[PDB]
Design a binder for this molecule. Structure first.
Ligand SMILES: Nc1nc2c(ncn2[C@@H]2O[C@H](COP(=O)(O)OP(=O)(O)O)[C@@H](OP(=O)(O)OP(=O)(O)O)[C@H]2O)c(=O)[nH]1
Ligand SMILES: [Mg+2]
Lengths: 193, 204
């Protein structure tokens, strides 16, 4: 029983972590905050921030470092590009994902009860993807030879975006294809359920 | 190839920080003060390769990257020697979580303070918020560096979070903000930090 991950249900943040933890084929338990005690919760993560990653001696839940730490903790297989010019780019991309994209999900998660304010938020998101379906052709996985964190960031996104209503069709082109073979991966497939 | 152009501005704390990292590595760094009128043609270039003229930007023929975590890691990709980060993943994560706090609380605020249309009351709440933590923060940067040095005496790496906290000080002095402590020892250290050769080569 080496390292356990505690995960709240709805989090897009908790999905993308169980993906990256799969690609590493590391035996790590998976627990639900909502299946434990209001006492232990305060012991594993005082600020109540899920998901959390416990080890014999360590503990971590920083949104920005959680995944980057999984990729370094269990090193093989690397979830960052090998070529330097591709790694430097892929980082600046994760940052865009977290900071320009995840906000769009939280917003669609908070003003979710307002149908007038959803239909218009969707219209702006679907409109933006299609202004990028152009730079999606020419790679099996996102802007890369193999699987990156960028794919874990984006699986969890599409997946939680789906549950919030927003779906992806044939209208998106490369994106739909990419989204379909992203869902194909065994690592994404597990956390999905 | 190695046409590394580092777009910076004057008195921008992030540029000064990056410039001393490139200096530490040895990077062939064609610096570009986009604050000078002369470089008007470069700032034209920059508003094209980045979305909001992001300063500083580290560009080559291959990429154009902004954000400070990005750049710092980029530099470590392009110039492994000598090592900026620790080696144990836990210690690396911590340096990253700390660097986030130092950026939100100090760097980001140091910038808000350079805004000419700032309320004199708001600007005073910033200046104070900073004093309030600068010390406790400093300690953490230390405790952490102490661990990362011993757990590997043969590795001998440069603490990036001590390098940054040094510039936070310089900019305290620079903004007439006061470093609230009477610890004669702490004071001894903050003087040493500003007394390091690579630091005096940068601001010069
Ligand atoms: N001027 C300047 N700012 C930097 C630099 N590096 C990081 N920042 C800023 O630090 C702020 C904190 O961003 P992060 O810690 O990375 O993530 P977060 O905003 O979601 O908490 C960002 O501003 P923000 O307004 O909070 O978000 P955003 O609009 O940039 O996305 C970001 O623009 C830099 O080198 N120069
Ligand atoms: Mg942001």
């Amino acid at each position: 029983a080496m390292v356990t991950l505690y995960t709240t249900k709805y989090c897009p943040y908790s999905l993308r972590a169980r993906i990256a933890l799969a690609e590493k084929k590391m035996s790590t338990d998976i627990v639900e905050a909502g299946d434990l005690e209001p006492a232990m919760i305060k012991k594993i993560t005082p600020n109540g921030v899920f998901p959390v990653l416990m080890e014999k001696d360590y503990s971590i839940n920083n949104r920005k470092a959680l995944l980057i730490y999984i990729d370094e903790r269990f090193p093989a297989p690397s979830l960052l590009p090998n070529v330097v010019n591709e790694r430097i780019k892929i980082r600046l991309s994760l940052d865009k994902i977290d900071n320009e994209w995840y906000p769009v999900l939280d917003q669609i998660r908070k003003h979710r009860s307002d149908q007038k304010m959803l239909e218009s938020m969707f219209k702006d998101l679907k409109e933006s993807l299609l202004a990028m379906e152009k730079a999606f052709t020419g790679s099996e996985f996102f802007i890369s030879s193999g699987f990156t964190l960028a794919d874990c960031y984006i699986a969890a996104l599409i997946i939680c975006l789906e549950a919030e209503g927003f779906i992806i069709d044939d209208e998106y082109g490369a994106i739909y294809e990419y989204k379909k073979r992203l869902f194909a991966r065994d690592s994404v497939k597990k956390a999905n359920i | 190839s190695n046409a590394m152009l580092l777009y910076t501005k004057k008195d921008d704390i992030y540029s000064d920080i990056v410039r001393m990292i490139l200096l530490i590595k040895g990077a062939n760094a064609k610096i570009v003060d986009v604050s000078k009128e002369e470089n008007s043609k470069h700032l034209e270039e920059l508003n094209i390769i980045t979305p909001n003229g992001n300063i500083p930007t580290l560009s080559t023929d291959d990429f154009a990257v902004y954000r400070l975590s990005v750049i710092i890691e980029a530099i470590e990709d392009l110039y492994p020697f000598p090592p900026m980060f620790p080696v144990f993943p836990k210690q690396r994560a911590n340096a990253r979580i700390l660097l986030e706090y130092v950026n939100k609380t100090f760097l980001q605020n140091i910038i808000k303070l350079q805004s000419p249309d700032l309320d004199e009351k708001q600007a005073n709440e910033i200046k104070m918020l900073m004093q309030r933590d600068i010390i406790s923060t400093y300690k953490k940067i230390v405790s952490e560096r102490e661990v990362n040095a011993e757990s590997n005496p043969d590795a001998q790496n440069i603490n990036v979070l001590t390098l940054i906290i040094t510039f936070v000080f310089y900019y305290f002095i620079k903004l007439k903000i006061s470093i609230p402590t009477k610890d004669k020892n702490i004071i001894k250290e903050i003087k040493e930090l500003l007394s390091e050769p690579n630091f005096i080569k940068t601001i010069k």
